Amino acid sequence: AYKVTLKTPSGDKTIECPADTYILDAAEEAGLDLPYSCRAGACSSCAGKVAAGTVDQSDQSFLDDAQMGNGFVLTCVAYPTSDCTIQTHQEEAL
Ligand code: FES
């Protein structure tokens, strides 16, 4: 699996996520407690910010082009495509 380093307000936690699993789902399977609501890619509750590595969030609808270009990600609909580092709890930085 890809190693996903979640940089959270309570420290960095690196977890495993296969290519076919959403970031948010892997984090909750690993025991993290990340923000979410709709789980459909249509809000900002689950927003993270990619510091390194790549994700595929092609089904997302809520972020604009500039936000995605700055690394923002909806973790509920994002698959990893490499080992990656994602700051969590980023909704208020949008
Ligand atoms: S929880 Fe709404 S987009 Fe992820």
UniProtKB/Swiss-Prot annotation:
Q: Which GO terms describe its biological process?
A: electron transport chain
Tell me the ranges covered by the 2Fe-2S ferredoxin-type domain, including all copies.
Answer: 2-92
Q: Does the keyword GTP-binding apply?
A: no
Enumerate the subcellular locations listed in this protein's record, separating them with semicolons: Plastid, Chloroplast
Keywords attached to this Swiss-Prot or TrEMBL record, sorted alphabetically, are:
2Fe-2S, Chloroplast, Electron transport, Iron, Iron-sulfur, Metal-binding, Plastid, Transit peptide, Transport
How many cofactors are bound and how?
Binds 1 [2Fe-2S] cluster.
- Name the needed cofactors: [2Fe-2S] cluster
- Residues given in the record as [2Fe-2S] cluster binding sites: C38, C43, C46, C76
Q: What role does this protein play?
A: Ferredoxins are iron-sulfur proteins that transfer electrons in a wide variety of metabolic reactions.
The entry assigns this protein to a family as follows:
Belongs to the 2Fe2S plant-type ferredoxin family.
Listed under subunit, the entry gives: Forms a complex with heterodimeric ferredoxin-thioredoxin reductase (FTR) and thioredoxin.
Record-given protein name: Ferredoxin, chloroplastic
Organism of origin is Chlamydomonas reinhardtii (Chlamydomonas smithii)
Q: Which residues of the full protein are shown?
A: 32 to 125 of 126
